[PDB]
């Protein structure tokens with residue numbers, strides 16, 4: 074019966090103004106709850122959540138993806154690779170009750186877009202229309218990438234998401250955000266000093282820091298710098314691969330180009346698997362709180 | 368020689384969006400500093416402030432009024448009638464730093480408008496264009512009304528502000544907000560249960576509560592109820608006077624009508640003494656924080 | 662639970678400043694502007710005998726728990742349109758946790 | 770003053786978690802991502818010895834006191850457009866008050 078089809082259906086009677094208010098609510102809670110994770114804030118974990126709900130997508134049969142909003146169900150919830158994302162879900166649940174008309178998928182992806190922008194990242198155009206689907210459509214565990222791999226694994230994995238070399242290197246710049254937590258992933262440490270502000274630091278630290286391969290307290294191995302930063306084995310593989318390396322150099326030298334490419338790739342990621350109608354509205358570019366004087 | 372005319376002059380290059388951001392900054396600080404005065408908040412003192420800087424007006428020679436922003440000068444600032452308003456000025460001080468272009472008069476009146484709207488009161492149309500005037504234009508003390516008086520005094524006093532019976536009874540409904548503080552005025556206590564939400568409770572409590580005239584701890588005489596509420600002698604005189612009584616009963620039965628009349632009289636109060644040019648902008652209706660998704 | 666936990670001593674000061682003027686908590690406490698709140702958790706809305714509610718509060722028919730309490734106290738008129746509870750709302754999460762923590766033990 | 774003396778202990782926890790990763794405070798402490806902050810108060814912006822500033826931090830030329838420091842920390846790139854200090858900002862007044870109080874003592 075071929076890959077199934079997911080048709081974006083705009084929440085009945087809603088437009089830009091409605092979603093901007095959801096944006097604002099998320100954005101205001103981001104500013105208010107500044108203590109979380111030793112004052113890193115909820116920004117990075119909301120970006121990770123958007124990626125994890127989207128990263129389940131399989132282009133071959135159109136299963137997974139952000140459309141169905143299936144992370145709200147137990148099976149995807151207790152996915153061991155989603156360890157720690159419960160915090161992001163609990164962050165968004167009171168806002169869901171505030172705007173119960175919004176689909177789970179639209180909410181999860183919007184949280185990602187809001188976090189990136191509010192952390193002074195690039196503008197990310199966002200489209201509505203994701204629709205909640207039954208529990209039996211929930212993707213099985215094991216669809217997300219393993220961090221203890223090399224460049225070839227990363228390149229092949231992301232083909233399943235229809236991403237090419239430039240898209241993957243751009244997306245991975247988001248690993249300047251937040252940190253790995255030993256209790257969640259078996260990895261520990263931040264990747265730089267600027268943990269909750271969106272910059273091209275990932276690429277700069279990748280090239281300019283002195284990295285050493287070490288065992289952490291979970292006996293997993295990671296690249297550590299004397300300044301106290303870490304890189305996952307998959308992240309470091311970006312400078313082991315010649316094609317990835319040239320793109321890494323590119324973003325290190327030009328944050329503007331990085332911002333533009335990340336915006337495109339992140340939107341594509343959040344929209345993978347979704348069929349947008351001809352009469353579908355143009356994507357929204359939300360204003361930040363700063364722009365609104367809020 | 369020749370009558371004093373105060374012509375509204377718009378802050379250079381400023382428009383609605385500029386003042387909406389001043390509104391928002393006031394409204395956010397309202398919600399942030401919510402512990403003030405045992406969690407009453409800054410709402411009530413901000414509307415008292417707008418009233419006190421406006422209530423200096425004399426219709427006969429157009430002295431006083433909100434135009435000149437002369438409350439920033441020592442003589443008016445240390446008026447015994449303004450005791451306790453320092454807190455409201457301190458509140459707006461960081462706001463004025465953020466928006467140095469706005470006149471003192473526009474800031475004080477906008478404070479009152481913002482507080483009323485954010486306390487779920489009626490929308491109050493507001494106009495900009497007040498201009499700071501020199502220290503020598505500062506009104507002498509004694510122009511504000513005394514609380515230990517009767518209905519005749521109230522009526523006569525408000526004649527000087529060009530206010531009729533319906534206007535004064537409406538304006539007086541603001542005494543639902545906040546409380547009297549012994550250290551400030553020599554009176555103590557709230558007028559009712561809902562202290563920082565704008566309602567018609569002042570009128571209902573005036574005729575549904577059983578009041579007794581007592582001496583407080585400053586030896587001033589005030590009307591007390593068994594519920595623990597108080598009224599000033601001037602407040603109670605509104606149900607002693609037959610003409611005032613009929614209007615009090617009207618508002619006690621129709622909050623929508625009270626809201627409409629208050630909105631008119633309060634804007635008139637804040638604009639007394641100001642000449643608006645024919646090409647001056649139409650009055651602004653600011654969106655509340657809630658209307659912006661917050 | 663979705664409701665974490667807060668300070669009961671801080672919750673107590675919130676209740677006395679922002680709730681007590683309309684609500685009593687102890688057993689047999691009198692109805693005031695608002696209904697007595699003893700046994701509010703584990704009770705459907707608008708069911709305290711002796712108090713006259715709005716139709717809105719009664720028809721809402723929600724079973725009060727720590728979570729829908731938090732939603733209600735954030736913006737009373739939004740959660741129950743037509744309610745006559747005139748309240749600014751607890752716009753801070755910590756304040757909500759603190760008060761609900763106190764309210765749970767106080768209305769035992 | 771407009772600025773108020775807050776908690777130095779709370780300011781210390783604020784500094785440890787949001788500043789220390791880029792700044793040291795004690796006398797003669799090393800420059801890291803950002804300049805060492807010893808003797809920052811009463812000193813013009815861009816005067817730390819050995820650090821490489823942006824020409825936006827220098828041309829601002831502001832005499833750091835507890836007042837304009839509060840403005841800077843609220844929003845760095847708004848007060849100084851072009852600074853390479855990537856920091857969200859202390860948006861809460863009490864947090865700013867607490868941090869400055871700590872920073873006053875620590876940078877003496």
Ligand code: HEC
Nearest residue numbers: 560561679680683694695706707708714715718744745746
């Ligand atoms: C008066 C000024 C009040 C203040 C302040 C608070 N409440 Fe209230 N409450 C008030 C009224 C008039 C009503 C009935 C509303 C209606 O539509 O009938 C209520 C109701 C409640 C309820 C629901 C009770 C029930 O369903 O049986 C709760 C749980 C409640 N109020 C709690 C509450 C808290 C915790 C407050 C302060 C933080 C608070 N109220 C303020 C009147 C007033």
Ligand code: HEC
Nearest residue numbers: 266267787788791802803814815822823826852853854856
């Ligand atoms: C890196 C991720 C930083 C964080 C977090 C904080 N600061 Fe910062 N700061 C940083 C840089 C790279 C610079 C130099 C800016 C330039 O354009 O050259 C600064 C600057 C300051 C200054 C001004 C110093 C001077 O003018 O001599 C101050 C007073 C300062 N920083 C303080 C400060 C505080 C209190 C912070 C946390 C609350 C903080 N910074 C965060 C890098 C980074």
Ligand code: HEC
Nearest residue numbers: 117118121124218219220244247250251252253254257258
């Ligand atoms: C576009 C966004 C994005 C992409 C793509 C992405 N991540 Fe990350 N991931 C994040 C963010 C942001 C964090 C930090 C979250 C936090 O601090 O809580 C994170 C954290 C992690 C962590 C640690 C989580 C913890 O709490 O310990 C692991 C492990 C991880 N990612 C693996 C991967 C791997 C492997 C890939 C690809 C091969 C990948 N991620 C791709 C955004 C992304």
Ligand code: HEC
Nearest residue numbers: 411412415418451512513514538541545546547548551552
């Ligand atoms: C439209 C607004 C308005 C008008 C008109 C008004 N007031 Fe009030 N006044 C207030 C508000 C609001 C407060 C509460 C301030 C607070 O809670 O800090 C207040 C406070 C007071 C206080 C006590 C101040 C203190 O801190 O103890 C006195 C006394 C007072 N007003 C006298 C009067 C008298 C007398 C009149 C008229 C005869 C009058 N006011 C008219 C709004 C008004």
Ligand SMILES: Nc1cccc(C(F)(F)F)c1
Nearest residue numbers: 248251252264303304305
């Ligand atoms: N997953 C993650 C999160 C933050 C930083 C990093 C590092 F910089 F180490 F790559 C990885």
Ligand SMILES: Nc1cccc(C(F)(F)F)c1
Nearest residue numbers: 542543544546556557558
């Ligand atoms: N004087 C005065 C002022 C404001 C409020 C009240 C009260 F609410 F107490 F009636 C009285």
